[PDB]
Amino acid sequence: ARERRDRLHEALSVNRSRVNQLEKQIAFCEA
Amino acid sequence: AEMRARERRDRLHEALSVNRSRVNQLEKQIAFCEA
Helix, strand or coil: CHHHHHHHHHHHHHHHHHHHHHHHHHHHHHC | CHHHHHHHHHHHHHHHHHHHHHHHHHHHHHHHHHC
16 A cells, blocks of 8 residues: 555655746746 | 644644745745846
8 A cells, every 4th residue: 555655645746846847937937 | 632732733724824825926026026
C-alpha cells in the first residue's frame, strides 16, 4: 500500500509544482 | 484536551487561508505599481 500511495504523493507534488511555475510565468507575462 | 486542540487548529487553518489570499493580491499590487 505504501509504495503506491507514496509514488502518488510525489506525483502530486510534481504536478502542483508545475502548476505554480506556469502560473508565475503567466502572471509575469500579464504585467 | 481533544476539543480544545481541534478548535485551536481549525482557527489557525482558517487564518492561514486568509493570509495566502492577502499575500497573492498584495503581490499583484506590488508588481503592477513597481512597473
